[PDB]
Amino acid sequence: ASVHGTTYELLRRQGIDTVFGNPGSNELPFLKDFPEDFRYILALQEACVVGIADGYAQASRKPAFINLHSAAGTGNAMGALSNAWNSHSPLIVTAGQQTRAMIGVEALLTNVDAANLPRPLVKWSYEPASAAEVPHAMSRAIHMASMAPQGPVYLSVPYDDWDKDADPQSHHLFDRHVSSSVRLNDQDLDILVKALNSASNPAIVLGPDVDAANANADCVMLAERLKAPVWVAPSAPRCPFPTRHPCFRGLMPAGIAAISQLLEGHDVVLVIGAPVFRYAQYDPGQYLKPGTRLISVTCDPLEAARAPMGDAIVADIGAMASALANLVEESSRQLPTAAPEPAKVDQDAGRLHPETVFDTLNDMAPENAIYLNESTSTTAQMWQRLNMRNPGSYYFCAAGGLGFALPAAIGVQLAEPERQVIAVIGDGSANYSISALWTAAQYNIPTIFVIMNNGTYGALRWFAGVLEAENVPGLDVPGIDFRALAKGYGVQALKADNLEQLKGSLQEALSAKGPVLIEVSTVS
Amino acid sequence: ASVHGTTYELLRRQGIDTVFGNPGSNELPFLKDFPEDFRYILALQEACVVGIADGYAQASRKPAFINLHSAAGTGNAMGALSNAWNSHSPLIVTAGQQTRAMIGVEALLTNVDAANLPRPLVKWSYEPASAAEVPHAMSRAIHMASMAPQGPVYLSVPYDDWDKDADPQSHHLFDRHVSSSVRLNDQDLDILVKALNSASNPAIVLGPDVDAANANADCVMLAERLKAPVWVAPSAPRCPFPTRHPCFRGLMPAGIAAISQLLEGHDVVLVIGAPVFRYAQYDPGQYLKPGTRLISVTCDPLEAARAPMGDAIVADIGAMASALANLVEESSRQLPTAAPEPAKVDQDAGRLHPETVFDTLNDMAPENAIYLNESTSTTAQMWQRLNMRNPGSYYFCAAGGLGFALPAAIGVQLAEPERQVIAVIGDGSANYSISALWTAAQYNIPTIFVIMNNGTYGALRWFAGVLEAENVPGLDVPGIDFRALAKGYGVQALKADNLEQLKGSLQEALSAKGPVLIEVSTVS
Amino acid sequence: ASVHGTTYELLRRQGIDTVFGNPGSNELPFLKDFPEDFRYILALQEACVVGIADGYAQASRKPAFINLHSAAGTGNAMGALSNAWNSHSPLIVTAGQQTRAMIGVEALLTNVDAANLPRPLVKWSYEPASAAEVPHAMSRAIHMASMAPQGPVYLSVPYDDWDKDADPQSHHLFDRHVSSSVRLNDQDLDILVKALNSASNPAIVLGPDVDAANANADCVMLAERLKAPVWVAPSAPRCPFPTRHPCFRGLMPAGIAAISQLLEGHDVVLVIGAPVFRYAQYDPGQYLKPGTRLISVTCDPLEAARAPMGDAIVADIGAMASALANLVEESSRQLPTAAPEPAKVDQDAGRLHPETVFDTLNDMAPENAIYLNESTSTTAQMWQRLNMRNPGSYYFCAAGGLGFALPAAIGVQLAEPERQVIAVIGDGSANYSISALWTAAQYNIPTIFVIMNNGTYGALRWFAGVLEAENVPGLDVPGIDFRALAKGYGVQALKADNLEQLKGSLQEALSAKGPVLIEVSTVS
Ligand SMILES: Cc1ncc(C[n+]2csc(CCOP(=O)(O)OP(=O)(O)O)c2C)c(N)n1
Ligand SMILES: Cc1ncc(C[n+]2csc(CCOP(=O)(O)OP(=O)(O)O)c2C)c(N)n1
Ligand SMILES: Cc1ncc(C[n+]2csc(CCOP(=O)(O)OP(=O)(O)O)c2C)c(N)n1
Ligand SMILES: [Ca+2]
Ligand SMILES: [Ca+2]
Ligand SMILES: [Ca+2]
Ligand SMILES: [Ca+2]
């Protein structure tokens, strides 16, 4: 068998049936004779390709396979890879290399020092020393991406390898099962359980890896058992807990002082599936106040090592969440104090307040909708105003890199055809990966895109303010007509200039059969 | 003085007055109090930012300064950097980093292992160990980018560095002059000149570093003295010779065998400012026929080292071409005769053949027009049909990475306000950096964009045909309305469905006030 | 508190009380005011420094802390790091950097691009962005080295950081506890146990990570319950099983064909704590014969990924071995029979056969002796001829890099004062880290070094034979007087030219009060 035949058999045998790509000449010998049990999903730019694959992998909780063109195609995707590294997304990224006989002269399309290109944003980066080694290298990539902590991997393949003979012994790769579904040994687990049972005022902090493991329901039970308030860790890439559950306290502000303040008085704080912590703003203070002890459960040795405080357990989030939920005692303490309701902001008949938009979405959207957030100045209000009951209901660029939400929303929707995806994106953020719109139209993926148009990089103006920074250039982005861009890529488009048009536009969008973009005029 | 003030003084004193960027919070402390004598050029995505800067650098023959946002911004720009490396473009790429206090815990927006991110696509990549080091590091970046062989460099700066005190001894940096304007020693140069004079059938091959050095006229004189035919080196990123000069033989095919054959019978072949050679397609054969010796003058040790044949001299293209042009004897051989005018292709009333488009451009465009090419299936035709008399008349993605031409064309037009820039771009290639249109609209940069629309990845269909590769997915790109995309970003748009409409469109575009996009229906 | 004081407090609080080092000016500010509760072990060359720390770490089953001088010092130690990478040795390598103010100009002793220097032989490599970050960085280093899979890490520290103020919040770092003592979830573990119980002819293969985890006794219980033969995985860096246990089958030959043949007819093969597999020689064939299924338990994701066959489980060896040993049934099959004693090789009154040496070592050495092996041509006979009943009884350079055993023997003896360490080292290998002898003499570490002198690079002459290679230079090393070398560094030296002298020498060495070298004349 050829490297080509053996490689597709490996992918198939390992559950891969979809290739997200943008093609090039180094990739044609791989893409030729494309098997009928595979589908290829085309996007017009590599950030869009990876972004879509990323959404797909996160929502489906399975690895996604990607094919890109040499260095330029790989390079165009590196921004998306930075997000993917932060979200522990299992992405298998392959790039075509020049034919081996032409690598030495550095012919055009040669990916020079290829394995170094995507570093440091990948768990593993590699180019095989021979054609017969390709299926083995593909095996490694698959497993490296899939083992905890999950993440993007990179494989470069000289295009003449595909037609060479495969090692007959490659058949051994086909059914390899590799598991990292592990938890803390019985002895130390019981110690942890006693600490949780003995705490007088415990708190729970949940991260994106909970939602990735679909450990949400086990965490609910755990929180109910302990009667503990539940926070989502800062800079949340996903939503790990029902946001209207009695225990839920909301999204932590991404500041050192703000967080030690929030956890004051809690004797034991259990963090699960989050870095400790993904701070953002400079907010100097204490990591923890005295009297507070912190225990972190993470699937990532890098997270365990860099936490500046607390104990850590490196283990599978699914296995640990399940064991803990079923081992801890039912506490007779009182549930946390009901959270206040978010205020209704006064709305005139002009441009829309973000809060008006979120209140209206929360009224009209289905209970199992899935939201994506790339409206960077409105995150806090979004978390306060959207009731998200189910797992896998929220995505936000995990490295803060814009250009994620628009293509990711397509990948999510492709992964969850029965759940309505609604992407809330600022006019600024919309541009980074605008061309992803075409993929939604072409394949008829019925994502809804709500563009929050206030003419400016809102978040940057805000930071500029608190910084007292005057005469900063480049903060405004006037003169973009999103209905026309949507038309350009074949996507139905609406406009909402006021509350009544917003209601009407959403009503129409939910009823539509394909993708729809709504430009909303929002206040400055 | 602050690091901030000192650094802008260094930039200013080293000739930099323009900043190409897409802002982020790590960058605000740098961008605040933006000097009134500086200009900031906003682009909506980082591939676009760098593409514009690249075009500006290549046309101005001076370094361009870029400011990107941490890892995600840098990552988005890496495809554009692949091109810039191959074209020896002097780009100073700066990226904002988290405040030093927050790097350890890897807060959101921390650029991890930052110097490694852009490798291997930069000459030098660095993050200063303290704030007072920043001006010096910036000084290193400026010179590393500018010295032969020019190319992109990378500087990461923790945002808290800008308000710190600068070392007063930094003033020594302001006026440093660094030169690599060197040429071969007299003794060996005389030996070279003698071999040139003694050649009975010399040939000359010119690459992009000739045009970068503005060494075109010297090469014309050299060619006239030697009575030698002149070829452009394959995969040409620029045009180094007037294309209607009698010595001109056109663009070499990017094949090993094709090139040895073209050179057969030429006893001495002098290559100036080109890799030897940027082959592309698989065309196995002899590098040189017996009877041919090759001599290469290059500014790049990496090029001199990887050449599979001939002697090399590593030196400045401007200094070498000027020496040789002035030292060689006037040969008494007959001047080569001009190559044949290209054939007029039969154009019916349907869709436009590419040949028709180029003929029409050549007829109607000003004699000092500047062309950019990202119409990948039509490059050969373009080289044959455009009379480019002047230096800096042509640009093509140096690494073959798409998404270059559209932003670069804006950068070039900004660098040459008196020369009409005309970018010819395939419907496929247009999408990669589509949002760059907005910068042209916003800064009133009257670039003309000619979209060759045949609804397919044409060059890939062709390659798939030569490989006889069947069932390749992802080659077609139907359903893109380019006039709507143009309207989306505020740029006037026109359509041309036949030759007659192309003429009216072209005439209207040339007289138009701002940038114009013309969507042209072409054949397959 | 200064960074100095906070760092030493961190080290003591994390159980470190020893520093292995070779000092330089960049390290003086660290090494000054050296705490009275710490000891410093000096070695004369960095390969020896790291070798000694490596032995100490592997024998103690705890991290060892190393301090080297800048780049030159780190570089001298990279050979040793390659062994340490392969043996999963938890080594904390710190190196002194130039003062921050002088890094820019690359003053002498500047470690340029320091974090890249030791790559790719480290798990984590880093230089902090500020002095206050140093304790945190050091905390990250300790845990990165200590978490499974254990391995070497690198930290570069500018020498001016030490006297700066530490962040008071660094106190949270002191008592951090990080665990990776995890095992397969209950349901999947039950499934593995069923497969083991159900096997009709199981075999067990053990790697160095069993011995590192001290899972030897659990592995014995497991082999006894399953009634299964036990092999040590090829290229063994440690001994994970009593070599005279009736189940023991010896060291596996390091070849693909040889191993599948060995495993033929075994329906289930369980591999614990080893790469699958560390083949060495070319010996192509089937990875496994049909009818054979392989299940691998490994602590290293990179191992699980690159296995060309079998399933894998990534978990802590100690926890997994214990769980498996206690859950499997007692098989009704008969217990394997002990391997026959090796035959006595005939020995005349002249030079010694290696076999004679090993038989004699075995007869005279204490039952709890510890052997190190760097006699490369005699490894197979060594494994057959030494009864090693207890854990931690054998060490062999894990990457095949010579220069390990001599210094490592000293580290092991230091970690195990009550177990006699005996190093068996070829005359070739002894030279790589010859100066380590001095450290044994100075600190009175009573290691016994046995030098096998046959005047040649024996294993290389052998390979030259099987390649049929002729006229290979550099294979002989005549003219070295090891007794003089020992004298040179203050180590008592003895000679054994024949069997009688060997017994006399060994007797004297085994009761000596300090280190002893015996130069043994062995046969060509
Ligand atoms: C690739 C990339 N470039 C730049 C940034 C920095 N950045 C953070 S927020 C922001 C503005 C986003 O504007 P918009 O999408 O309109 O949302 P708004 O802040 O106005 O609500 C930018 C440019 C980034 N995070 N990623
Ligand atoms: C970033 C990047 N992605 C993909 C490619 C591969 N590629 C080379 S040519 C080509 C087709 C370009 O199509 P178009 O612009 O419509 O020009 P045409 O071939 O039809 O003349 C593609 C996708 C590339 N070179 N760079
Ligand atoms: C640092 C290093 N250099 C070279 C080698 C290659 N090598 C393997 S075995 C060997 C010979 C060792 O000779 P000796 O120690 O006398 O043992 P013998 O083979 O004679 O039994 C050499 C040089 C190596 N493994 N590591
Ligand atoms: Ca906005
Ligand atoms: Ca096309
Ligand atoms: Ca020897
Ligand atoms: Ca003794």
Ligand SMILES: [Mg+2]
């Ligand atoms: Mg890189």
